[PDB]
Amino acid sequence: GHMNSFVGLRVVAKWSSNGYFYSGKITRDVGAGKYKLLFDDGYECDVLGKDILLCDPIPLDTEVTALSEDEYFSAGVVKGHRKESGELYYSIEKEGQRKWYKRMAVILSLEQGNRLREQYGLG
Amino acid sequence: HMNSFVGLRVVAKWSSNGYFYSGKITRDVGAGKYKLLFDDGYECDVLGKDILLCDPIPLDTEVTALSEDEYFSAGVVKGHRKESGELYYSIEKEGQRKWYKRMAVILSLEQGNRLREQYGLG
Numbered sequence: 001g002h003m004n005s006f007v008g009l010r011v012v013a014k015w016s017s018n019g020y021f022y023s024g025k026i027t028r029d030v031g032a033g034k035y036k037l038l039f040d041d042g043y044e045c046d047v048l049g050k051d052i053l054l055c056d057p058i059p060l061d062t063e064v065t066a067l068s069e070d071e072y073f074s075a076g077v078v079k080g081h082r083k084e085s086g087e088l089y090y091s092i093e094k095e096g097q098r099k100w101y102k103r104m105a106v107i108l109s110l111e112q113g114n115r116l117r118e119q120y121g122l123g
Numbered sequence: 124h125m126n127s128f129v130g131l132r133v134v135a136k137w138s139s140n141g142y143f144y145s146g147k148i149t150r151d152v153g154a155g156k157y158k159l160l161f162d163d164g165y166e167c168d169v170l171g172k173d174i175l176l177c178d179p180i181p182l183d184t185e186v187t188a189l190s191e192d193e194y195f196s197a198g199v200v201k202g203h204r205k206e207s208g209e210l211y212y213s214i215e216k217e218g219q220r221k222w223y224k225r226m227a228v229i230l231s232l233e234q235g236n237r238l239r240e241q242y243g244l245g
C-alpha cells in the first residue's frame with residue numbers, strides 16, 4: 001500500500017507573518033518545494049520545505065519559546081520529553097526552574113528555528 | 124460612559140472558514156476592526172463581528188477541545204479553575220470530564236457563529 005513519505009510526519013513549521021515555527025504535521029507533499037501543513041490548532045495552509053524543521057521531538061538542549069497564559073516570548077531550554085497517554089510533553093527549563101508543557105505550547109522564534117535548520121531543515 | 128475593550132480577552136476567528144481561538148484585543152483599529160493577539164503570538168486585524176467578548180467561555184457552551192491528534196473533539200464547558208494564574212476548563216465528553224488549558228479550548232466555525240448574537244462585537 002502507501003509507501004512511507006513525508007506525509008504524516010510531525011514537524012515544526014514557520015508562520016510567515018511573524019517568523020515563528022509552530023507544531024504541525026505534513027498532510028500533502030504538493031511538489032515544487034510546497035507542502036500542505038496542518039498546524040496543531042486545526043488550521044491548514046501551504047508551507048515551503050525550507051521553512052519546515054523535521055523535529056519530532058525537538059531535541060534536548062534546544063532553546064525554544066514556551067507558551068503559557070499571558071506569555072508569548074518566554075525563552076527556555078528543552079531538558080526532556082515524554083509521552084503521557086499518547087501525547088508528547090516537553091520539560092522546559094527557565095532560570096533553574098522546570099515546567100512540563102504540551103507539544104503544541106512549544107514554539108520557536110525565527111532565531112531559535114534557524115539554529116536547527118542545518119541539521120533539521122526538510123529542504 | 125465609554126467602553127473600550129482593549130486588553131480584554133476574547134475568542135475570535137481570523138480566517139474566513141476558521142475556528143474561534145483564544146486571544147486578546149490589543150488595539151481598536153477603526154472601521155469595525157480590532158487588532159487581536161492570539162495566545163500563540165499571532166497578531167492580526169479582525170472584524171468585530173468575528174470577535175466574541177467571552178472570558179471565561181460560559182458554562183454549557185459547546186466547544187472543541189484540542190489535544191494531540193484531536194482536531195474535532197467536541198465537548199461542553201462544565202467548569203473552570205485557575206492553577207498558578209492559568210485558566211483551565213473542565214470539558215465533558217460522553218459523560219466524562221477532563222481539564223484543558225485555555226488555549227486548547229476553541230470554537231468551531233459553527234460553534235462560534237452560534238454565539239455571535241449574544242457576545243459578538245459586531
Ligand SMILES: CC(C)(C)NCCCNC(=O)c1cccc(C(F)(F)F)c1
Nearest residue numbers: 015022039040041104144161162163165
Ligand atoms: C499561527 C497559527 C496558524 C499556528 N495560529 C493562528 C492563530 C490562532 N491559533 C492559536 O491561537 C493556537 C491555539 C492553539 C494551538 C496553536 C498552535 F500553536 F499549536 F498551533 C495555536
